[PDB]
Amino acid sequence: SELEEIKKLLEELSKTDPLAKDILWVIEVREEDGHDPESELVFIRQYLKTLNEPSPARKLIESYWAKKVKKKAFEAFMKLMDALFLAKDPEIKKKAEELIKKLKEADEKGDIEELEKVVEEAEEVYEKVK
């Protein structure tokens, strides 16, 4: 899948860079212990962020994480709209409308962090409907 080609790309980058070598080592050591590669993917992107070094190729690959979260936000939005039209409480409906507006604005600025922070609240609100 897309993760496999991402591993291949990071492998090719590793042949030229140390950072990618460490990334691939992390992927392998998590794989061998029976854990979701995507959880380690988000964690490793977070580690890259906190490192703060430019390291442009690796961060550009991790932009795949931005792609994945951007797709996920669509499902979150759709759930929130379904709840808003079918919410059991008016206050829940107003909160859902506020969350929808926040999601649209966050995408407008193209900010991934706000997208994450808002999809969390989206799932929290969706809990009530189901």
Binding site: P18, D22, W25, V26, V29, S39, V42, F43, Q46, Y47, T50, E116, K117, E120, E123, E124, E127
Partner: protein, 753 residues
Amino acid sequence: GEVCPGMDIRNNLTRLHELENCSVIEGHLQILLMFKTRPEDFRDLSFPKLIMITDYLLLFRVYGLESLKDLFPNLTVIRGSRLFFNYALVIFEMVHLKELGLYNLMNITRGSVRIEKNNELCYLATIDWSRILDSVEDNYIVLNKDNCPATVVERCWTHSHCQKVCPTICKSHGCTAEGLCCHSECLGNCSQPDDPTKCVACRNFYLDGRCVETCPPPYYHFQDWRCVNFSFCQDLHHKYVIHNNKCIPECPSGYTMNSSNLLCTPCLGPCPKVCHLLEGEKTIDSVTSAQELRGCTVINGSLIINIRGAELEANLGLIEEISGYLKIRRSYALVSLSFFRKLRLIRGETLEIGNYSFYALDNQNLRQLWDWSKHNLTITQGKLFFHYNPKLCLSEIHKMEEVSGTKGRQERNDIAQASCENELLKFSYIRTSFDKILLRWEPYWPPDFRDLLGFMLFYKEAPYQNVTEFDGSWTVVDIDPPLRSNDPKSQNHPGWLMRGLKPWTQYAIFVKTLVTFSDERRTYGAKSDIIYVQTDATNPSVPLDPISVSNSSSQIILKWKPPSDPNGNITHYLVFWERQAEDSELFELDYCLKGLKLPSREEHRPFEKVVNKESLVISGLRHFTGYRIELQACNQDTPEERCSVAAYVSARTMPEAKADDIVGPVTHEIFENNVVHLMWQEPKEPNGLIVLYEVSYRRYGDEELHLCVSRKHFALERGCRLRGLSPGNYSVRIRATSLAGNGSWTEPTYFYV
């Protein structure tokens, strides 16, 4: 004679009568302020028995002294072991002294004379201090009235008595009063010549009327003067010590004695030294005070710490018990009170106002007090005070109460920013590469989960499990919270790793939570335990300092030192050596060019798993034969071995000066046309190889001549083919010349040419 101690006389010439039964002043004389005295007193008062001082004379304002000779006619040696301001003799300000007159002084082992401001003091330039004194840099002499050997001028204390200078052959060893050289062990003068048992002084050590080099037990040294049995020193000590066969006053540093065992045995490094501070009290605010009290292995008196802010622990951490109370106040930069390694029991004998045996105020940096996991500190009694210092949490004070045994002596009024992590953070996952380590732990959320401001992670190399959490240093980086992650499972387990860590080094790791400082009740957070993680072992560094010395012709000893970066327990050194054939240019080209132009230029390499032998003794080689060596070092044996890349050295065995000649004689044949053909076989184990052979051929009546036959010349002519030969018997001697050098000439080969 009789020995005495040293005393000083002041304005009472009566006391001076005590020296009639004296022979040596085990100390220093002194006379001064004899105003009451008159010339009628000392004009004839004499004490000839005196024969030698040990520290120094002196005089001052002695009114009446006409000539000092009337007092010490026999004084001979002023050891000057103890000096009155680097001055052995000191005369000063006596107007009645016409002349020193003392005509027996014969050595001043130390210091220098000093005479000044004396009227009527004659006979000064006539005293050859260079001869008597041993160093005359400062014979300070000013403001004064100023037959026998002369040094341009005759030298004499008095016109009636000169300096007792004798021939130089007597040396400092001294000479009789009549001027005869004495025994070497004697000094100044001897009653009999060459008799160590008949002289007054003693260069090294006096003994029972003899001049000797040391005292015999039980009679040891004594202030490097004389010899006294053990009981003498014991009685003096009872009212002194014993050490290095020397009954010295007090033993040196790092030593101490026992009442029964007078000898001061070495102590345990820190020797017991009770320190009574000024009025049994003191204050510490700067490193200067700590240095001033450095090394006080024990204390007696309360100590107060009021300091600003390693050095302290160097100057502190020496005491097990403090007689008085200890107090810390206003020292705002006290990270923790663990500068007192030894401190074990505050005796609390001296108690502070209110009966307090401890006190802490205005010191809001006391991260901790002691490593209470081990430190068995105790307190005898007394209350405690920790107001305005709640930076340390009340749990630590409770631990104080339990360990100190002060449960019934404390109240909450002893305590007042608080940052005691009330929860615990458990690591959930850690893996170790050869230079990088993973970290994961439970995702702690404070009850106000919004508050969390990212975890903080610390680590440092810990070759031994010491860990000084809260001391400082170390500490590296921080992390941010992963995300709320909503609810059950899939919390994302916040984590972090490191990259640049050396292989095979224990690492101490712990993570603390950096939570927002909420002024209201704060869920301080979780402080993870301290864990030790040791990274993996990678391949070592190349073995270092390889030198392939040669000790025997066919044997080689190779010495190498441990690799600079073992990066793993060196299981065993793997050594590969291979024999190398000589260079093609050293085996093909011709090498008989006159004016020698000799060119100046599975593979189971025999190997051994040398274990712990950093210098190998290779065997089975060939003298001066090419050899390629290689030093494989590994830190792993049974599994895939991490044998680092080897170093290299092309050692050449030392040549044999037996297997480099032409083994056996030289084969030859003769022709009727004055032509002779030669033939021979080279040794099969030469010094590496034999490239050329030195020939030498002679005829009777003629003289020997040499021809060169190389390997190419040998093959082309099947050896050699001599031409231009005169009739007569011949003689040929040939010596092989390997790369090492010329070997041995062959047996004279005889024939007719």
